[PDB]
Amino acid sequence: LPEARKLLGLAYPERRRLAAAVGFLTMSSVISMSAPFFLGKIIDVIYTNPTVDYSDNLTRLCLGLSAVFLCGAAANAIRVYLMQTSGQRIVNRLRTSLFSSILRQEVAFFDKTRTGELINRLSSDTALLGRSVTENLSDGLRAGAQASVGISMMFFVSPNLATFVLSVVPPVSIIAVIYGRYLRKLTKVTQDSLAQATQLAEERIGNVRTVRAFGKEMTEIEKYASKVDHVMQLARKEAFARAGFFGATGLSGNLIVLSVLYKGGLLMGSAHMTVGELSSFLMYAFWVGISIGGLSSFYSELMKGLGAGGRLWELLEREPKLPFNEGVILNEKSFQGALEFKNVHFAYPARPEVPIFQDFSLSIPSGSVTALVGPSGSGKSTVLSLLLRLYDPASGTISLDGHDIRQLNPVWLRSKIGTVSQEPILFSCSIAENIAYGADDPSSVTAEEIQRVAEVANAVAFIRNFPQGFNTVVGEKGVLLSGGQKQRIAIARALLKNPKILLLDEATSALDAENEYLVQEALDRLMDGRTVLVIAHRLSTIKNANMVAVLDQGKITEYGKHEE
Amino acid sequence: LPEARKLLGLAYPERRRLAAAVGFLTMSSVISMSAPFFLGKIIDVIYTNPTVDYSDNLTRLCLGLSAVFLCGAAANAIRVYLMQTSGQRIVNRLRTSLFSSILRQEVAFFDKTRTGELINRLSSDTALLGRSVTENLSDGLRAGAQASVGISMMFFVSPNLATFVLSVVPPVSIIAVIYGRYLRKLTKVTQDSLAQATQLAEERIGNVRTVRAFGKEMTEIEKYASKVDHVMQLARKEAFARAGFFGATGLSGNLIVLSVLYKGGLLMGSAHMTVGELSSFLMYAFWVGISIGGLSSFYSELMKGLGAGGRLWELLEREPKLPFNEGVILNEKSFQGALEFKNVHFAYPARPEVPIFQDFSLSIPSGSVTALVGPSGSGKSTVLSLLLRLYDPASGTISLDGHDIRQLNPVWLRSKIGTVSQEPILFSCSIAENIAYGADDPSSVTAEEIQRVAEVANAVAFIRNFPQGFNTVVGEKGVLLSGGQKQRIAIARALLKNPKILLLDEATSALDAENEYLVQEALDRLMDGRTVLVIAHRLSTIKNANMVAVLDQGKITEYGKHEE
Ligand SMILES: CCCCCCCCCCCCO[C@@H]1O[C@H](CO)[C@@H](O[C@H]2O[C@H](CO)[C@@H](O)[C@H](O)[C@H]2O)[C@H](O)[C@H]1O
Ligand SMILES: CCCCCCCCCCCCO[C@@H]1O[C@H](CO)[C@@H](O[C@H]2O[C@H](CO)[C@@H](O)[C@H](O)[C@H]2O)[C@H](O)[C@H]1O
Ligand SMILES: CCCCCCCCCCCCO[C@@H]1O[C@H](CO)[C@@H](O[C@H]2O[C@H](CO)[C@@H](O)[C@H](O)[C@H]2O)[C@H](O)[C@H]1O
Ligand SMILES: CCCCCCCCCCCCO[C@@H]1O[C@H](CO)[C@@H](O[C@H]2O[C@H](CO)[C@@H](O)[C@H](O)[C@H]2O)[C@H](O)[C@H]1O
Ligand SMILES: Nc1ncnc2c1ncn2[C@@H]1O[C@H](COP(=O)(O)OP(=O)(O)CP(=O)(O)O)[C@@H](O)[C@H]1O
Ligand SMILES: Nc1ncnc2c1ncn2[C@@H]1O[C@H](COP(=O)(O)OP(=O)(O)CP(=O)(O)O)[C@@H](O)[C@H]1O
Ligand SMILES: [Mg+2]
Ligand SMILES: [Mg+2]
DSSP states (O other), X not given: OHHHHHHHHHHGGGHHHHHHHHHHHHHHHHHHHTHHHHHHHHHHHHHHOTTSOOHHHHHHHHHHHHHHHHHHHHHHHHHHHHHHHHHHHHHHHHHHHHHHHXXXXXXXXXXXXXXXXXXXXXXXXXXXXXXXXXXXHHHHHHHHHHHHHHHHHHHHHOHHHHHHHHHHHHHHHHHHHHHHHHHHHHHHHHHHHHHHHHHHXXXXXXXXXXXXXXXXXXXXXXXXXHHHHHHHHHHHHHHHHHHHHHHHHHHHHHHHHHHHHHHHHHHHHTTSOOHHHHHHHHHHHHHHHHHHHHHHHHHHHHHHHHHHHHHHHHHHSOOXXXXXXXXXXOOTTTOOOOEEEEEEEEOOSSSTTSOSEEEEEEEEOTTOEEEEEOOTTSSSTHHHHHHTTSSOOSEEEEEETTEETTTBOHHHHHHSEEEEOSSOOOOSSBXXXXXXXXXXXXXXXXXXXXXXXXXXXXXXXXXXXXXXXXXXXXXXXXXXXXXHHHHHHHHHHHHHHOOSXXXXXXXXXXXXXXXXHHHHHHHHHHHTTSEEEEEOOSHHHHHTSSEEEEEETTEEEEEEOSOO | OHHHHHHHHHHGGGHHHXXXXXXXXXXXXXXXXXXXXXXXXXXXXXXXXXXXXXXXXXXXXXXXXXXXXXXXXXXXXXXXXXXHHHHHHHHHHHHXXXXXXXXXXXXXXXXXXXXXXXHHHHHHHHHHHHHIIXXXXXXXXXXXXXXXXXHHHHHHXXXXXXXXXXXXXXXXHHHHHHHHHHHHHHHHHHHHHXXXXXXXXXXXXXXXXXXXXXXXXXXXXXXXXXXXXXXXXXXXXXXXXXXXXXXXXXXXXHHXXXXXXXXXXXXXXXXXXXXXXXXXXXXXXXXXXXXXXXXXXXXXXXXXXXXXXHHHHHXXXXXXXXXXXXXXXXXXXXXXXXXXXXXXXXXXXXXXXXXXXXXXXXXXXXXXXXXXXXOTTSSXXXXXXXXXXXXXXXXXXXXXXXXXXXTBOHHHHHHSEEEEOSSOOOOSSBHHHHHHTTXXXXXXXXXXXXXXXXXXXXXXXXXXXXXXXXXXXXXXXXXXXXXXXXXHHHHHHHHHHOOSEEEEEOOXXXXXXXXXXXXXXXHHHHHTXXXXXEEOOSHHHHHTSSEEEEEETXXXXXXXXXXX
């Protein structure tokens, strides 16, 4: 009931479309149900009168049936459209709402949740939920109403035969459900064993570097073959039980129809029924069987949509553990760009056992370049993550001009901070759209503004040297760029943003004489007149930095000029 | 025909099972097809003789039909089992063969191919192909034979009515195919637009760090909402065309049956047919419709299995671009463990534009420790990749005791080389199974051997301090370990292998006083009496190394003792 209230409200804006479509589905289903009754009376009329010409009755009946069919087709067309479009609007409202919630979440959420699971929830579960309260709801509503009218019409036509069907079907069905529960058991065994075999396979393929290195390729191939040979053994046993079941199911099914043909046949011989009346009964009994299969599927789909519903309302009602757009903004006079770390203790959420900062304190003063130095994996890159407030420190404070960055609006805080990554990220957009991304409104930036920053960041040469120029679609689903190129576009983006604070994570790892010069020249133009925090790789940038801070074992172990 | 020859040979070892099951499917399908004919004659017998008692005929017919049904059920059970088990053996042979080919491939293959695609090919495509040459083949073979017997029986019963059905169904079907081609168009448009919207979504979620950093969360949420609002617009248009189609399809379907009921009804009135003979004809016409739907699905599944077949024979016949187990092995006297790089030029296959080594030459002499030193991303780790021959140099040679490592058996070459990674890889096995992995036969290693190396690698304390001890299932699908723990298990593995050459990639990045000591102590015991190549992070290991080699800009820029 608390879950059903959510599904009802979901379908609520579409209440009038779904009420009209269900109204058309009511008409069609019920008018359709009268056919076995009228076919029975026609069968008996023919039987009674083999000497009567029925051509004019047939012509009128078939002419009249055409108009009923033309209406039913026009009713069905409308019903389908109203149903499909109702579901589309529901799936649209679910997509916009789920995406909105996901982006609002803290970084830590994405550290613990896989993108594939979020995309599967935004693609498949939004699809399930939409068609569960629409197409499936109508599917089960028709099948439910058709078994209702069907069973009623079986008792109407013959209470003896209907009571007989009713005494035979449930016992047989119950025994078949039990065999079905045994079959499900042998199936999960086989599919659990197959999951293990696939996990073994997946793991070894994923880490073929370690398998090679130990000469265990032939060992794993044989280990896997042994596992899937055993699955075959379980599948053969599961195949014997499925053969027995299908054979028993078919026999029961046939013998139940043979029972009703026999019992009905005897009742006909005793003048308890006509051939028409029997034809009529068997058509309804067949219609009931389909309606039970219809209610059966509807349940399996309603369960699926409920499982999907739980996964969606999970993310739809998740409150980000870090503020999204709340807090204060600083005055023009009050904002100077001075930053301070005071006794920062931090360990990443995925590995909370590994401390990155253990009493980290660093004062980056306004307008001065500060070069961060330390061994590999010391936690230099994590400094930019904490400044952008992607995470909050466990202990201590990060302050901007004496204000705890926690009290400020994070979106605003990041509007003041520009960043140049080790390996920058470019979306599958144009080069110009990627540069425009720096601006507080990438729509307000003129072609001339994008061309200016591209010249200053030394990117205009390679961009213009591309077939489509600034309209060259980059990213993953586009034209692949070098690190030096990606970094210069990251500089162009930062130039456009015009931030008071700049955070550079140098990429001296991947650089050649041609790139490394135009990048160092662009980075010099960029650094000019900003509070800079540079993670220094090149000894040249350490040398002319106002201060050097050494990060060892999660703390600032040394602090002074390159000489001192 | 060249593809059909591969599918035939695939089913060939199961030829006798599939021939028996098809023989049972032939019996059942054809004996089943006679029912509308005999139902027609029974209908006419009743019609002609309303005053005759048929109780004893009915009882005998229903008793006889029970024995026919009991046989048919026993025939079907056998058929299903033979079919299911034939497919299981085919799917087993495909699994073992595909996995064998994958593991044999060079590392570069895995650098360019995603694990998900290889697992989907080993799970879903092995399943498709198996049931395509079995269950689907029988499905289409029955439906193909049933339309054959069905159409034949329609002309037998009434050539006028069958010729009539034949003149009406194809035109209507042809027009419906054209509308179906138009419907497919509007569907691909909507689903292409939805793919774009999902790619946008997937990309932004995947890189929420860059979206946050530019305060573009609200911008992307609105960008996505705009895209999926437009999909709704396309889906509404696609929904109108689907409504029109379904309505037209239903009308055509109903009016075709109304035509045959009318035409057949008129022929009855003219004494061209009996009611039984008409009942008979309509049952066959209904059976043909199902058989055409059966051949239709069979085609869609045969195409799917052929698409799967192309993807499997791709990897099944791929020749690894690097030898798997071929080459020479060196004599006990000839193998000393001396290594040499001479003018090595190498760029990784995924990024062939980025050179890692540009005339790299380094002589690591037998029994001496050589410490590799260089800036981050200089290509220090790539040295171990080339020594293990995961890749071959583009230019130059890597030699073992004067022998080009290319002329040697790579499995044997790696049996001489032990390795300790930055972040070691532990499979979802027991700690003991993971340690045993070092041995040339992890089955031949006694509990005492695994316990010895665990003591020496300083791992026995934390292992024994685990609830299940050496039987503690580690890896991803198991108990998560620290880097220091994973590294000490990597030392235990190397100790057991007992290699003449050892390649260490130090992890000074993640280390605390307790771990860093027991690891440095275990690594000292391990280094003892081996040709060592250590990528040095700790200044302590550089100091007591026989030689230090500096890697700058893809070459050995400096070479000498720590002091010199
Ligand atoms: C899948 C599991 C197996 C399914 C179970 C199959 C069981 C076999 C079914 C037998 C059906 C015949 O059932 C038989 O029907 C007739 C007609 O109603 C009954 O006959 C009796 O009642 C009818 C009225 O109803 C009278 O006209 C008749 O004179 C009288 O003998 C029999 O008493 C009954 O036994
Ligand atoms: C597996 C095969 C199963 C076949 C189906 C069962 C058939 C069993 C044989 C019984 C059929 C003969 O039984 C006979 O049917 C006719 C047709 O309804 C009945 O006839 C009755 O209804 C017809 C209308 O249909 C009237 O025209 C007629 O005046 C009236 O007597 C007879 O009173 C009955 O004796
Ligand atoms: C979905 C698209 C729409 C479907 C198309 C529907 C078209 C309408 C079908 C009309 C069917 C009636 O077709 C009609 O059959 C009777 C009986 O065979 C024919 O009747 C003629 O031949 C029969 C013998 O076959 C003689 O007994 C009869 O005396 C003579 O008039 C008519 O000449 C024919 O017109
Ligand atoms: C949408 C509704 C469609 C309903 C189906 C079509 C019915 C159209 C009306 C025609 C039926 C009456 O037509 C009549 O059928 C009976 C039964 O076969 C025929 O009767 C014939 O076959 C029966 C056996 O079935 C014999 O017992 C009889 O000796 C013989 O004459 C008549 O010769 C024919 O005139
Ligand atoms: N989201 C995350 N969750 C868990 N661990 C993470 C993480 N992001 C980074 N790490 C780990 O934190 C440690 C320090 O990260 P960081 O990137 O700050 O250091 P670094 O910049 O010193 C490495 P490099 O020398 O390559 O630039 C590393 O061991 C890294 O694997
Ligand atoms: N399979 C692969 N395909 C493409 N590029 C790869 C790669 N494996 C590594 N690289 C890249 O090659 C470069 C050098 O790699 P490598 O791991 O050898 O250096 P390193 O050991 O100096 C880094 P660290 O200081 O973190 O240990 C890096 O820029 C890395 O991203
Ligand atoms: Mg870094
Ligand atoms: Mg490395």
